Symmetry: C3
Subunit: 152 residues, 3 copies
């Protein structure tokens, strides 16, 4: 984990919570070292500094129901001074133009979303990566649904 | 604020700028730090070193118009020795592959392009980050379209 | 001398290669410095450290072929101890979900995929960026196909 004292975290999702996004620590490379902690599913940040922040979510859907599927992935900082979630990153993705699988019943889409960004954080700040539809989460984990920061 | 004696920058798209990607700092994490000067929509490099150049843009539209759009996102370098715009990171994105939609016309689409990599820049060379279709830019989320650097 | 004594890499994909992914520095914005070396198209890691490993591949295909194409992109660390491929990072996009374009010959789609994470390697490791379909890449690219590792 340490060498290089950097707050570092690279945390994997969890292929047990049937539809959810539980972050997991210890898998082959799931760095939670020196300073940063995961506490209620968030990366609590030590030090103070400019953290490079990243995550990827893989949404997986067999077919498309009537009405917009519209997926979303955000990373928000909950500040401990003037608190609350301040929005840092998120991206929107619509994986179906009207098709809506009757005919040749349900054949799959795959939608990766990846976020990356260098932000100034502060000692003790909490970090959230959330999706709006944990039903569409694929399972085959390590490099497929992940989250991380490193201090630069 | 400032940690480190690193040049950093994280500028954002002016949301009130009709049809042009125009950068901005002053905002949330809209850093211009140690010697990075933003100029004619571009970033002038202060120091010889590796920089991490990242950028994200978002594209929205509602319905898919005539047949073939192509959204492009390119970060370029107009360098202090090969003084010309060479090309650093680039992505093309096809929004809708048809619908054109007429039975029920404008259902919304959102495409996120993100870009980023380590390069060895020099003092004085500019970095540019344009998109070919500013009309397709989203300006309802700020944690969306930006451009930043940071020496490593 | 102040380039940097940091292991760094940024290889671009070679344009003269039919359906294969050949990585190449000795190119205009491709680094390889401080003992990293690209040996059998893979990256060998010089010292123990924490490394940001990132990767982008562009795919274009005109028309949407039958059944389901599925394009993948992953980075594997091929170790020094249990030295076979362990998947560090992975994404999967499917570009065609029906279209089959019959009385048409059809439109071209573009599909990019970005991969970036922080991982702890060990000395002598190898890292490989492998797509499942090289026959679908695109190279009037400058930054569209890349592989880079930087030591944090």
């Amino acid at each position: 984990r340490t060498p290089s004292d950097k707050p570092v975290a690279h945390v994997v999702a969890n292929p047990q919570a049937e539809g959810q996004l539980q972050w997991l620590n210890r898998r082959a490379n799931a760095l939670l070292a020196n300073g940063v902690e995961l506490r209620d599913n968030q990366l609590v940040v030590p030090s103070e500094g400019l953290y490079l922040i990243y995550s990827q979510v893989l949404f997986k859907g067999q077919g498309c129901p009537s009405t917009h599927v519209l997926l979303t992935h955000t990373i928000s900082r909950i500040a401990v001074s003037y608190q609350t979630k301040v929005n840092l990153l998120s991206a929107i993705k619509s994986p179906c133009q009207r098709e809506t699988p009757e005919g040749a019943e349900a054949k799959p889409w795959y939608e990766p979303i990846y976020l990356g960004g260098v932000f100034q954080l502060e000692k003790g700040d909490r970090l959230s990566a959330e999706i709006n539809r944990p039903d569409y989460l694929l399972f085959a984990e390590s490099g497929q649904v992940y989250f991380g920061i490193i201090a630069l």
